[PDB]
Amino acid sequence: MVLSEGEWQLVLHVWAKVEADVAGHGQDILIRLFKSHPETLEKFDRFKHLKTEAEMKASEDLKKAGVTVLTALGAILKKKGHHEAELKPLAQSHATKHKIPIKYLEFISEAIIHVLHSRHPGNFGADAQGAMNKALELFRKDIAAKYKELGYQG
Ligand code: HEM
């Protein structure tokens, strides 16, 4: 699939807002993911023991993980589709080391959309959300293809 320049502009416009507070968006997104799909928390051995949202909000390890997720995703989005190089090591670690099914990438994609919708209603209208969804679908499609080449595709 291919996004138009206009769609990339909508994506990068709201992303510039996200970058004003990377750590805060990172926390919100991961907490949303864990509350909606608790099974996903089990993959993070470092903080798999957190029981409540209050504990999650207080965790420095979870905040750092959120910053890591957003910084990596931001680098990918700014490539505007020319992200083959950035995707290789990411697909390898998530398929082979962490063992993250595509299903979970769909779950985090939904958490990202929910948080942007909550925090940036003025810059995340229907057209902007459609463009962000398309960009994340492109990301998931290319990652799924790499998973298969690596012997996982789970
Ligand atoms: C947009 C989605 C994602 C991005 C861009 C991303 C990015 C990263 C990055 C850059 C790291 C650091 C080095 C490495 O590759 O190991 C990492 C680690 C990890 N990721 Fe992801 N990730 C994503 C989604 C997920 C999901 C959905 C899960 C689990 C449900 C997950 C679980 C992990 C785990 C377990 C680690 C290592 C934690 C640690 O450092 O101890 N990732 N991810």
Ligand 1, from 22, 68, 137, 139: best to mutate by most atoms within 8 Å of Cβ?
A: 68
Ligand 1 close to Cβ of residue 71 (< 6 A): no
* Half-sphere CA count of 80, side-chain side, radius 13 A: 10
Distance 68 CA to ligand 1 centre (A): 8
Ligand 1 close to Cβ of residue 47 (< 6 A): no
**Which distant-in-sequence residues (6+ apart) come within 8 Å of 87 by Cβ?**
76, 142, 143, 146
If you take atom 24 of ligand 1, which residue's CA is the nearest one? Answer: 105
- Tell me, in Å, the resolution of the deposited structure: 1.8
Q: How far apart are CA 141 and CA 153, in angstroms?
A: 11
CATH number of the domain where residue 103 is located: 1.10.490.10
Distance 33 CA to ligand 1 centre (A): 13
Method underlying the structure: X-ray
69-84-18-45 Cα dihedral, nearest 10 degrees: -10
Provide the domain limits for residue 51.
1-154
The token pair at 113 is: 């959309």
Q: What angle do CA 1, 69, 48 make, to 5 degrees?
A: 125
The token pair at 117 is: 């919708």
From residue 79, give the alpha-carbon distance in Å to each of 8, 9, 50, 85, 139: 10, 12, 35, 10, 11
Ligand 1 close to Cβ of residue 40 (< 6 A): yes
Domain count across the chain: 1
